[PDB]
Design an enzyme around this catalytic site. Sequence first.
Site, short mmCIF file in Angstrom:
data_model
loop_
_atom_site.label_atom_id
_atom_site.label_comp_id
_atom_site.label_asym_id
_atom_site.label_seq_id
_atom_site.Cartn_x
_atom_site.Cartn_y
_atom_site.Cartn_z
N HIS A 183 -23.93 -0.04 17.03
CA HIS A 183 -23.46 0.23 18.38
C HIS A 183 -22.03 0.80 18.24
CE1 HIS A 183 -21.44 -0.50 22.07
NE2 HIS A 183 -22.64 -0.54 22.67
N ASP A 196 -19.12 0.77 19.71
CA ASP A 196 -17.98 -0.13 19.82
C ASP A 196 -17.93 -1.06 18.61
OD1 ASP A 196 -17.08 0.76 22.37
OD2 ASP A 196 -18.39 -0.71 23.42
N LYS A 197 -19.09 -1.58 18.21
CA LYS A 197 -19.15 -2.43 17.05
C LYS A 197 -18.81 -1.71 15.76
CE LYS A 197 -19.18 -6.66 18.08
NZ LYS A 197 -17.89 -6.74 17.34
N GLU A 243 -0.71 0.52 14.16
CA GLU A 243 0.50 0.18 13.45
C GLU A 243 0.22 -0.75 12.30
OE1 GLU A 243 0.21 -0.98 16.87
OE2 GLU A 243 0.43 1.12 17.46
N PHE A 249 -34.49 6.97 23.20
CA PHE A 249 -33.17 6.66 22.66
C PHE A 249 -33.12 7.26 21.25
CE2 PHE A 249 -30.38 2.48 22.08
CZ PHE A 249 -29.32 3.21 21.64
N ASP A 296 -22.42 7.77 22.84
CA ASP A 296 -21.45 7.00 23.61
C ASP A 296 -20.22 6.76 22.77
OD1 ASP A 296 -20.53 5.18 25.68
OD2 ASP A 296 -21.39 3.47 24.59
N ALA A 297 -19.04 7.12 23.27
CA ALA A 297 -17.80 6.87 22.53
C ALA A 297 -17.58 5.38 22.35
CB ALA A 297 -16.63 7.45 23.28
N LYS A 333 -16.15 -5.14 22.95
CA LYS A 333 -17.29 -6.06 22.93
C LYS A 333 -16.77 -7.49 22.82
CE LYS A 333 -20.77 -3.56 23.77
NZ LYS A 333 -19.81 -2.81 24.62
N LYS A 373 -1.19 -11.97 15.22
CA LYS A 373 -1.67 -11.59 16.55
C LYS A 373 -2.53 -12.75 17.04
CE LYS A 373 -0.37 -7.44 14.93
NZ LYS A 373 0.50 -7.30 13.74
N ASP A 408 -4.06 -13.25 19.68
CA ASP A 408 -5.36 -12.92 20.31
C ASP A 408 -6.53 -13.34 19.42
OD1 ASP A 408 -4.59 -11.66 22.71
OD2 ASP A 408 -4.55 -9.65 21.79
C1 SAM Z 1 -25.92 3.60 27.93
S1 SAM Z 1 -24.49 3.96 26.95
C2 SAM Z 1 -23.10 3.89 28.15
C3 SAM Z 1 -23.15 5.02 29.17
C4 SAM Z 1 -22.82 6.39 28.55
N1 SAM Z 1 -21.40 6.40 28.12
C5 SAM Z 1 -23.15 7.52 29.52
O1 SAM Z 1 -22.59 8.65 29.24
O2 SAM Z 1 -23.91 7.35 30.46
C6 SAM Z 1 -23.98 2.40 26.26
C7 SAM Z 1 -24.74 1.93 25.04
O3 SAM Z 1 -26.15 1.94 25.35
C8 SAM Z 1 -26.88 2.37 24.21
N2 SAM Z 1 -27.60 3.60 24.53
C9 SAM Z 1 -27.24 4.90 24.27
N3 SAM Z 1 -28.16 5.78 24.57
C10 SAM Z 1 -29.19 5.00 25.08
C11 SAM Z 1 -30.49 5.33 25.53
N4 SAM Z 1 -30.96 6.58 25.57
N5 SAM Z 1 -31.29 4.31 25.91
C12 SAM Z 1 -30.82 3.06 25.85
N6 SAM Z 1 -29.63 2.63 25.45
C13 SAM Z 1 -28.86 3.66 25.05
C14 SAM Z 1 -25.89 2.51 23.06
O4 SAM Z 1 -25.81 1.25 22.41
C15 SAM Z 1 -24.60 2.83 23.82
O5 SAM Z 1 -23.45 2.48 23.07
C1 SAM Z 2 3.34 -6.82 21.01
S1 SAM Z 2 2.34 -5.35 21.13
C2 SAM Z 2 0.84 -5.76 20.15
C3 SAM Z 2 1.13 -5.92 18.66
C4 SAM Z 2 1.45 -4.57 17.99
N1 SAM Z 2 0.24 -3.71 18.00
C5 SAM Z 2 2.01 -4.80 16.58
O1 SAM Z 2 1.98 -3.75 15.82
O2 SAM Z 2 2.47 -5.87 16.23
C6 SAM Z 2 1.42 -5.51 22.64
C7 SAM Z 2 2.15 -5.15 23.90
O3 SAM Z 2 3.38 -5.91 23.96
C8 SAM Z 2 4.41 -5.10 24.50
N2 SAM Z 2 5.47 -4.92 23.51
C9 SAM Z 2 5.68 -3.88 22.65
N3 SAM Z 2 6.80 -3.97 21.97
C10 SAM Z 2 7.35 -5.16 22.40
C11 SAM Z 2 8.57 -5.80 22.11
N4 SAM Z 2 9.46 -5.32 21.23
N5 SAM Z 2 8.84 -6.95 22.76
C12 SAM Z 2 7.96 -7.42 23.65
N6 SAM Z 2 6.78 -6.91 24.00
C13 SAM Z 2 6.55 -5.76 23.36
C14 SAM Z 2 3.77 -3.79 24.96
O4 SAM Z 2 3.34 -3.98 26.30
C15 SAM Z 2 2.59 -3.70 24.00
O5 SAM Z 2 1.54 -2.90 24.53
#
Ligand code: SAM
Ligand code: SAM
Lengths: 381, 381
Positions: free
Chosen positions: A15, A17-18, A56, A236, A244-245, A251, A275, A277
């Site tokens: 997929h 995104d995956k 980064e 499909f 699909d980008a 996810k 991080k 998250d």
């Molecule tokens: C349906 S697409 C998202 C919508 C798409 N960006 C569009 O332009 O309509 C999302 C996901 O569904 C799956 N997908 C892509 N083509 C498909 C198809 N023909 N039938 C079913 N699922 C599909 C893929 O996993 C894709 O990443």
């Molecule tokens: C902290 S950055 C995520 C981690 C980053 N990608 C890294 O390279 O460590 C996430 C968000 O925090 C904010 N951010 C960026 N620089 C920061 C800083 N110096 N202090 C606090 N928040 C910051 C911005 O909104 C940014 O999109």
Amino acid sequence: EGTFLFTSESVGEGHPDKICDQISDAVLDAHLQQDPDAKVACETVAKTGMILLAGEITSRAAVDYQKVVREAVKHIGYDDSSKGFDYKTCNVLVALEQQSPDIAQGVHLDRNEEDIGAGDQGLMFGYATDETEECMPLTIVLAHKLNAKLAELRRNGTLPWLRPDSKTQVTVQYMQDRGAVLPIRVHTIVISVQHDEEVCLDEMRDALKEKVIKAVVPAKYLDEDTIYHLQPSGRFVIGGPQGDAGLTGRKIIVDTYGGWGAHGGGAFSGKDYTKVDRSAAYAARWVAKSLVKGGLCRRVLVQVSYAIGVSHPLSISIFHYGTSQKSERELLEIVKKNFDLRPGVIVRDLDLKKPIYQRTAAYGHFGRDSFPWEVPKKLKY
Amino acid sequence: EGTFLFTSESVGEGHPDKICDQISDAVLDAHLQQDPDAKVACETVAKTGMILLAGEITSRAAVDYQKVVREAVKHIGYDDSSKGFDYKTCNVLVALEQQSPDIAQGVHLDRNEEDIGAGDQGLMFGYATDETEECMPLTIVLAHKLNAKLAELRRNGTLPWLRPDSKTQVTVQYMQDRGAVLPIRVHTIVISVQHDEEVCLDEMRDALKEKVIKAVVPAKYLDEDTIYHLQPSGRFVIGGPQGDAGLTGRKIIVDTYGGWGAHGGGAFSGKDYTKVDRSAAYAARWVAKSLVKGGLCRRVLVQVSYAIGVSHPLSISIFHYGTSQKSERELLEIVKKNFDLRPGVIVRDLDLKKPIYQRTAAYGHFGRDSFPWEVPKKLKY
Ligand SMILES: C[S@@+](CC[C@H](N)C(=O)[O-])C[C@H]1O[C@@H](n2cnc3c(N)ncnc32)[C@H](O)[C@@H]1O
Ligand SMILES: C[S@@+](CC[C@H](N)C(=O)[O-])C[C@H]1O[C@@H](n2cnc3c(N)ncnc32)[C@H](O)[C@@H]1O
Ligand SMILES: COc1ccc(-c2cc3n[nH]c(C4CC4)c3n(-c3ccc(OC(F)F)cc3)c2=O)cc1
Ligand SMILES: COc1ccc(-c2cc3n[nH]c(C4CC4)c3n(-c3ccc(OC(F)F)cc3)c2=O)cc1
């Protein structure tokens, strides 16, 4: 009465995104193999013929991004233009800079490891449910296993018309049980999977029911009323990034609990332990699973939150859905006595400098393979 | 006893992920202005000096992507290299293809509008809470308003050292009230905002407390114990895409309920109505808000799910947290009698071909500006 439906989805390794999550984590692992203290924030974007890395990284490692990306795509199975994407011939573009020195100075520079600040603000949740041995919702477990089965049958040549891009969705009817939940039956299954130009729809639908669903879902959950939506779009052939980008961190519900529990919004892949998250969500899962395996509750949700540059969580909350004899205050005290949720301590407890992240990036980060956050802590109280 | 903490965050218009959401929706609106039936799936990626559009659009509109992107960035406020990003001089790259014909044939080609299939499978949730008039959690409302205040003071020249990238986080202590929740006090506030090279940290912290927090958060919620983390990293000169790569659909919890309720994982921005990730989540919010404003409950969660190519939802579930005298079965019957959750009917009820999407892409999609999904439906039962 006393029953309800719940639906979760999962996606396959191909997929789009995956694909991005797996490449982001392949890049993270490549850095960690040489520099355990690499600071990594690698986003990946995938579209027809293109993998772009943006983000980064500050690291002492020497990483060959072309090789790492292409090897990840090869593993997924995109190895020919007939499949819509080929690791050998795709474009790999790199827009990677060092970590912002303003972030570095505020988070980790000249700080004792245990006292490193959170790498960002944010909120994170952990969840656990006793409905399965692995303490995960049945909906998401089944949805992941259906994708894994597709990949297995693709790789072993059983169903050679399969391609890597797939999605699944499972709806289960549950019985309420004093705050906990008991699965009764599978109400609906959806499977969509990319396929070759030669196989017909009826052959695919028959194989998906007989070789995929029946090989994964216990018969006791399936009955005459179960609804099957197999290849519901009807065709499909175009799939992967061409269809699909894809982007890293799109996810996040598939990665966690399939909609159960709660989510704070942060993506996991492509990020080192600083991080929160990722690290605090893993630690929150570890806490939740420890509370359930420790017999303190049957179902539990844990929220934590952080501020960038600050080590200790700003808030901690526990909700037991009415499944514990202990109050939220008592559970919070047990958690305080047993866990230290500073990122610089989570890294040690969960061994988060180890390059095992690509393994987490498909089929969910939780409920599998006895990763450190899945091994409950024995609680003292 | 009977109280708990909950934390939510929000981000400003110049946060890099939010820049991407706004650009994706500016592109969607540009198409809808000329072709109400445009099929749009526009992802945006932002990094130092770059906006990349990647995705799929099939439309009769003639859109100048360079102009649309640059105008969106100008509105946000990135108009000079001193701020880290400039709409006049950044790179705008376009990797947009037509919608996959396999998706088109399975979803909408030769289908009656009311009977168009869902554009993808997935699950979506709606949530509403009576704790505020707008039926939103106080944590997320306050977090959004803090970012809006920063943008206001930046734009009016009150605090000319402010730059567009900001994040906020609010922790509230709540009292449990028969399933509903009552805010008691603000426990912690975090604010981080990008700033110029000349302002000192003490000046920023004083202004954030006096001109931002006090102008947004009622004094009754703030006390001697409230914790403030203002500019906690100590320095945030580098910001926007230069500080952190942004992607569309990486702020899905900020876009919705700040962690309350639940989320199915789908992103909103850059998608037309046929993508149920957006339309069904808007309809689910509309249902939840209608149940609360209709006096049937005080707090409610609605789940819906779809299969690609199928019009009717596969599942519908309602959880009222113990705040309704009606059972889940009774509420489901009321929803069935009052709402039609096919995407081809939601489009009509919520006017989803109108080009108002860029307005939704910062400060949350819910609880503001009387969008159609925020105007409750009068229920008949
Ligand atoms: C349906 S697409 C998202 C919508 C798409 N960006 C569009 O332009 O309509 C999302 C996901 O569904 C799956 N997908 C892509 N083509 C498909 C198809 N023909 N039938 C079913 N699922 C599909 C893929 O996993 C894709 O990443
Ligand atoms: C902290 S950055 C995520 C981690 C980053 N990608 C890294 O390279 O460590 C996430 C968000 O925090 C904010 N951010 C960026 N620089 C920061 C800083 N110096 N202090 C606090 N928040 C910051 C911005 O909104 C940014 O999109
Ligand atoms: C007395 O014992 C009980 C009593 C109730 C319920 C229960 C019922 C229920 N009806 N619809 C849902 C949701 C799909 C809407 C229910 N949920 C529930 C609530 C939140 C969840 O996570 C996340 F979505 F927020 C997941 C499921 C229950 O928990 C379970 C046990
Ligand atoms: C008897 O009346 C009540 C009884 C309990 C609670 C309540 C308490 C509570 N302690 N910690 C949390 C969560 C932060 C962990 C609580 N939550 C809660 C649960 C789910 C939420 O949404 C999403 F995160 F899933 C949001 C809040 C409550 O609902 C509220 C009212």
